[PDB]
Design an enzyme around this catalytic site. Structure first.
Site, PDB file in Angstrom:
ATOM      1  N   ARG A   1      72.948   8.287  38.240  1.00  0.00           N
ATOM      2  CA  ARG A   1      72.919   9.170  37.042  1.00  0.00           C
ATOM      3  C   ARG A   1      71.557   9.090  36.225  1.00  0.00           C
ATOM      4  NH1 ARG A   1      78.502   5.423  36.902  1.00  0.00           N
ATOM      5  NH2 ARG A   1      76.848   3.988  36.356  1.00  0.00           N
ATOM      6  N   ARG A   2      70.688   9.132  36.958  1.00  0.00           N
ATOM      7  CA  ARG A   2      69.552   8.990  36.174  1.00  0.00           C
ATOM      8  C   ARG A   2      68.400   9.866  36.835  1.00  0.00           C
ATOM      9  NH1 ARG A   2      68.844   2.077  36.004  1.00  0.00           N
ATOM     10  NH2 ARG A   2      70.729   1.930  34.458  1.00  0.00           N
TER      11      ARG A   2
ATOM     12  N   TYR B   1      54.991  23.710  32.508  1.00  0.00           N
ATOM     13  CA  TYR B   1      55.994  23.037  33.505  1.00  0.00           C
ATOM     14  C   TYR B   1      55.141  22.346  34.829  1.00  0.00           C
ATOM     15  CZ  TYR B   1      59.213  25.416  30.749  1.00  0.00           C
ATOM     16  OH  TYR B   1      59.811  25.898  29.478  1.00  0.00           O
TER      17      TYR B   1
ATOM     18  N   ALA C   1      67.250  30.480  23.979  1.00  0.00           N
ATOM     19  CA  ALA C   1      67.357  31.465  25.092  1.00  0.00           C
ATOM     20  C   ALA C   1      67.569  32.987  24.557  1.00  0.00           C
ATOM     21  CB  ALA C   1      68.512  31.177  25.943  1.00  0.00           C
ATOM     22  N   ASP C   2      66.670  33.814  25.268  1.00  0.00           N
ATOM     23  CA  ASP C   2      66.744  35.150  25.027  1.00  0.00           C
ATOM     24  C   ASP C   2      67.656  35.783  26.085  1.00  0.00           C
ATOM     25  OD1 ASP C   2      65.942  38.040  25.601  1.00  0.00           O
ATOM     26  OD2 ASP C   2      64.303  37.659  24.744  1.00  0.00           O
TER      27      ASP C   2
ATOM     28  N   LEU D   1      70.633  36.901  21.288  1.00  0.00           N
ATOM     29  CA  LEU D   1      70.159  38.174  21.351  1.00  0.00           C
ATOM     30  C   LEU D   1      69.547  38.722  20.302  1.00  0.00           C
ATOM     31  CD1 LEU D   1      71.306  39.921  23.967  1.00  0.00           C
ATOM     32  CD2 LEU D   1      73.334  40.448  22.799  1.00  0.00           C
ATOM     33  N   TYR D   2      68.340  39.460  20.915  1.00  0.00           N
ATOM     34  CA  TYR D   2      67.574  40.349  19.753  1.00  0.00           C
ATOM     35  C   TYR D   2      68.045  41.352  19.405  1.00  0.00           C
ATOM     36  CZ  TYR D   2      63.948  36.670  20.064  1.00  0.00           C
ATOM     37  OH  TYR D   2      63.055  35.501  19.791  1.00  0.00           O
TER      38      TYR D   2
ATOM     39  N   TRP E   1      52.327  34.990  32.521  1.00  0.00           N
ATOM     40  CA  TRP E   1      51.705  34.181  31.395  1.00  0.00           C
ATOM     41  C   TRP E   1      50.189  34.511  31.004  1.00  0.00           C
ATOM     42  CZ3 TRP E   1      53.789  29.558  29.734  1.00  0.00           C
ATOM     43  CH2 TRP E   1      54.972  28.992  30.242  1.00  0.00           C
TER      44      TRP E   1
ATOM     45  N   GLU F   1      56.179  32.174  40.308  1.00  0.00           N
ATOM     46  CA  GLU F   1      56.213  31.259  39.326  1.00  0.00           C
ATOM     47  C   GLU F   1      56.489  29.924  39.676  1.00  0.00           C
ATOM     48  OE1 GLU F   1      58.880  31.272  35.570  1.00  0.00           O
ATOM     49  OE2 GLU F   1      57.051  31.771  34.709  1.00  0.00           O
TER      50      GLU F   1
ATOM     51  N   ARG G   1      61.759  32.906  14.508  1.00  0.00           N
ATOM     52  CA  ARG G   1      60.318  32.621  14.327  1.00  0.00           C
ATOM     53  C   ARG G   1      59.786  33.841  14.581  1.00  0.00           C
ATOM     54  NH1 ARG G   1      57.361  31.160  19.949  1.00  0.00           N
ATOM     55  NH2 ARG G   1      57.215  33.184  20.107  1.00  0.00           N
TER      56      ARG G   1
ATOM     57  N   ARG H   1      66.868  24.709  25.429  1.00  0.00           N
ATOM     58  CA  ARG H   1      67.131  24.793  23.638  1.00  0.00           C
ATOM     59  C   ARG H   1      67.143  25.984  23.082  1.00  0.00           C
ATOM     60  NH1 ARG H   1      61.629  26.157  22.928  1.00  0.00           N
ATOM     61  NH2 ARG H   1      62.228  26.321  20.770  1.00  0.00           N
TER      62      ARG H   1
ATOM     63  N   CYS I   1      61.002  25.761  26.932  1.00  0.00           N
ATOM     64  CA  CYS I   1      62.168  26.060  26.531  1.00  0.00           C
ATOM     65  C   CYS I   1      63.286  25.524  27.624  1.00  0.00           C
ATOM     66  CB  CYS I   1      62.482  27.851  27.039  1.00  0.00           C
ATOM     67  SG  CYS I   1      61.887  28.973  25.892  1.00  0.00           S
TER      68      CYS I   1
HETATM   69  O1  LIG Z   1      76.981   4.250  24.615  1.00  0.00           O
HETATM   70  C1  LIG Z   1      77.237   4.252  25.586  1.00  0.00           C
HETATM   71  C2  LIG Z   1      76.434   3.293  26.376  1.00  0.00           C
HETATM   72  C3  LIG Z   1      76.613   3.067  27.965  1.00  0.00           C
HETATM   73  N1  LIG Z   1      77.640   3.897  28.693  1.00  0.00           N
HETATM   74  C4  LIG Z   1      77.725   3.820  29.774  1.00  0.00           C
HETATM   75  C5  LIG Z   1      77.238   4.889  30.822  1.00  0.00           C
HETATM   76  C6  LIG Z   1      77.264   4.265  32.322  1.00  0.00           C
HETATM   77  O2  LIG Z   1      78.692   4.257  32.584  1.00  0.00           O
HETATM   78  C7  LIG Z   1      76.660   2.943  32.334  1.00  0.00           C
HETATM   79  C8  LIG Z   1      75.062   3.162  32.369  1.00  0.00           C
HETATM   80  O3  LIG Z   1      75.033   3.558  33.754  1.00  0.00           O
HETATM   81  P1  LIG Z   1      73.620   4.503  34.212  1.00  0.00           P
HETATM   82  O4  LIG Z   1      74.133   5.584  34.645  1.00  0.00           O
HETATM   83  O5  LIG Z   1      72.375   4.124  33.576  1.00  0.00           O
HETATM   84  O6  LIG Z   1      73.345   3.885  35.650  1.00  0.00           O
HETATM   85  O7  LIG Z   1      76.996   2.593  30.596  1.00  0.00           O
HETATM   86  C9  LIG Z   1      78.119   4.854  27.831  1.00  0.00           C
HETATM   87  O8  LIG Z   1      79.013   5.641  28.620  1.00  0.00           O
HETATM   88  N2  LIG Z   1      77.941   4.999  26.664  1.00  0.00           N
HETATM   89  O1  LIG Z   2      62.022  31.657  30.356  1.00  0.00           O
HETATM   90  C1  LIG Z   2      62.036  31.885  29.158  1.00  0.00           C
HETATM   91  C2  LIG Z   2      60.943  32.085  28.093  1.00  0.00           C
HETATM   92  C3  LIG Z   2      60.952  32.422  26.752  1.00  0.00           C
HETATM   93  N1  LIG Z   2      62.185  32.506  26.050  1.00  0.00           N
HETATM   94  C4  LIG Z   2      62.217  32.801  24.722  1.00  0.00           C
HETATM   95  C5  LIG Z   2      62.893  32.062  24.008  1.00  0.00           C
HETATM   96  C6  LIG Z   2      62.944  32.296  22.452  1.00  0.00           C
HETATM   97  O2  LIG Z   2      63.404  33.849  22.404  1.00  0.00           O
HETATM   98  C7  LIG Z   2      61.397  32.633  22.500  1.00  0.00           C
HETATM   99  C8  LIG Z   2      60.573  31.318  22.153  1.00  0.00           C
HETATM  100  O3  LIG Z   2      61.003  30.975  20.832  1.00  0.00           O
HETATM  101  P1  LIG Z   2      61.138  29.503  20.241  1.00  0.00           P
HETATM  102  O4  LIG Z   2      62.511  29.287  20.025  1.00  0.00           O
HETATM  103  O5  LIG Z   2      60.275  28.415  20.744  1.00  0.00           O
HETATM  104  O6  LIG Z   2      60.673  29.574  18.538  1.00  0.00           O
HETATM  105  O7  LIG Z   2      61.092  32.984  23.949  1.00  0.00           O
HETATM  106  C9  LIG Z   2      63.112  32.622  27.155  1.00  0.00           C
HETATM  107  O8  LIG Z   2      64.366  32.889  26.452  1.00  0.00           O
HETATM  108  N2  LIG Z   2      63.154  32.042  28.272  1.00  0.00           N
END
Ligand SMILES: O=c1ccn([C@H]2C[C@H](O)[C@@H](COP(=O)(O)O)O2)c(=O)[nH]1
Ligand SMILES: O=c1ccn([C@H]2C[C@H](O)[C@@H](COP(=O)(O)O)O2)c(=O)[nH]1
Lengths: 316, 316
Positions: free
Chosen positions: B178-179, B146, B220-221, B260-261, B82, B60, B23, B218, B198
């Site tokens: 697990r949620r 955030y 990282a720098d 890594l830039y 920011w 922050e 980008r 998603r 990010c």
């Molecule tokens: O494709 C799938 C669908 C369901 N489950 C499983 C995950 C958990 O064992 C349970 C859902 O439980 P919770 O973690 O949501 O409570 O069903 C999978 O592993 N893979």
């Molecule tokens: O806490 C933070 C904030 C920003 N960035 C970086 C990630 C990317 O280098 C850039 C955002 O770029 P996009 O991937 O969104 O395009 O800023 C981090 O690594 N860590």
């Protein structure tokens, strides 16, 4: 072999996992945080150490890709993987006038032959859904399932966002984008969902004409769950690439709580005694390119020579 | 040492990373998919191989926890991390009547001494935000940051969801869930955001009275980004635990595109020549427990003996 990261995942929770109690009331040996990657150029990751129904995977994926949320499409292809969700609702409705299926889940795996009347009532439901439109529309539609979340994200202003569709155009128009994400985790729905998405979200990555994908699974059933997840998202990766003219790269699988149900120990132990075989080959229809208009006929699995299937008592 | 997974992450993209354009128009050596974990009982993961401003991290985090989205809180604590987001908007407004700051980002790192007039104009903006309420409310509030996403998720029916607040009660009332997820990725906003999150999402996990956390980043720098992310989420993990009466476990960090830039190679190479030191100790206020009402004074960093700081040309 291609599917060794799977087996290793299992062995690690078998040996390193800790006992932890869960939602459904069985026990689990669970770990937290784990990643494994499958290079999709070496073959398709459909487990060989155990026979896994590609048809159920394929038909479930195509249903997703259609933004379809009605169980009817599945039943049409003999996929009953999602029935119990629609049934649960059927039972809790004014119209249901039949043998009370309370907590049928536990009450079937259990000793009573509730399952006898269960399966025939289910057969009725399934037939109603398959033949009566008004019924199909009433209980046959789940609403908040993947296909809805992927191809029809509901905004605040009431509209619909085609996350996946948009993400694909983005990959074609901006391959090197670190924002190619499709999420299934809506914070405003989770609190009232029966099963919040297990496949919380995924991210695409393009580099060197290769399309990779990373899937984040908040919770996983190593033995029954994970085998499917792998083939489903590896297939997705292949399809999206087939469209974006790209080559297939890797399938990275990240886990939140990766767990093995205590009633699956012998089963998993048996599977680990097997020696993997050469993985199968996926063959997509070259002429067809719109993955949203694909059908069972366009996806060919080749050279699948799996060990027989390990039956396993499902939890709940 | 505690912070070895960091150094190793860097070395892996230095040696194994591939050149990929991005980008912002600098180049990057990037990999896709990577996980590293820090056991928070061995010490706090604030890099020793380079001096990192805990104050900026702390202030922050507290701002986030308050659901605060106004830059004023930050400026009050001398945190200017920011500013440029609010400035970008200031410049694009009818009221701005000053030295046209077009693409100031590139035009400051570049040769022209635009930065001279830039910094004084910024100083003015910052002072306006700090002293004039109407102004603070107009440009000082970012909106979709955030703290907003964590403590004020906007639903379709117009209301506000306190994701984090709810998740914490869930941990107290259902440790083995697990949620336990907090997401920052709203599909209906990403397309119009200047910087989609990010830190896409995080998941908590309780077991053995230990509270773990996994963060999915998603993008990282490695050099400038990752050091902060680690201390921020490790601090979050410590705070949430302090409240839920739990013990601290691990901090798992998962990556999408870890990069890594290209203008940070010498810098990172220099850091890798250093030998880690004993990590610092975090000390929270025992008497205070409501993490949402914490202040700088309640978080003590102990025994931090870092190597001097490596200056680095920021990209854009
Ligand atoms: O494709 C799938 C669908 C369901 N489950 C499983 C995950 C958990 O064992 C349970 C859902 O439980 P919770 O973690 O949501 O409570 O069903 C999978 O592993 N893979
Ligand atoms: O806490 C933070 C904030 C920003 N960035 C970086 C990630 C990317 O280098 C850039 C955002 O770029 P996009 O991937 O969104 O395009 O800023 C981090 O690594 N860590």
């Amino acid at each position: 072999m291609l599917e060794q990261p799977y087996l290793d995942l299992a062995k690690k929770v078998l040996d390193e996992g800790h006992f932890k109690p869960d939602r459904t009331h069985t026990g689990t040996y669970s770990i937290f945080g784990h990643q494994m990657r499958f290079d999709l150029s070496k073959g398709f990751p459909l487990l060989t150490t155990k026979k896994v129904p590609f048809g159920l995977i394929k038909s479930e994926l195509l249903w997703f890709l259609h933004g379809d949320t009605n169980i009817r499409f599945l039943l049409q292809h003999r996929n009953h993987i999602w029935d119990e969700w629609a049934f649960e609702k059927w039972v809790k409705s004014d119209e249901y006038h039949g043998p009370d299926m309370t907590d049928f889940g536990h009450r079937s795996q259990k000793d009573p032959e509730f399952a006898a009347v269960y399966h025939e009532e289910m057969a009725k439901f399934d037939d109603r859904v398959l033949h009566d439109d008004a019924f199909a529309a009433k209980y046959g539609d789940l609403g908040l399932v993947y296909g809805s979340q992927w191809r029809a994200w509901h905004t605040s202003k009431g509209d619909t966002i085609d996350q996946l569709g948009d993400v694909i155009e983005q990959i074609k128009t901006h391959p090197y984008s670190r924002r190619l994400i499709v999420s299934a985790w809506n914070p405003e729905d989770v609190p009232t969902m029966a099963l919040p998405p297990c496949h919380t979200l995924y991210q695409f990555y393009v580099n060197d004409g290769k399309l990779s994908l990373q899937l984040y699974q908040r919770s996983a059933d190593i033995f029954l769950g994970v085998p499917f997840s792998i083939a489903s998202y590896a297939l997705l990766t292949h399809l999206v690439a087939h469209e974006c003219g790209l080559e297939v790269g890797e399938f990275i699988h990240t886990f939140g709580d990766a767990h093995l149900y205590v009633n699956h120990l012998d089963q998993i132990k048996e599977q680990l005694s097997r020696t993997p075989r050469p993985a199968p080959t996926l063959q997509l229809n070259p002429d067809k390119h719109d993955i949203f208009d694909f059908d069972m006929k366009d996806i060919k699995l080749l050279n699948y020579d799996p060990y027989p299937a390990i039956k396993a008592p499902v939890a709940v």
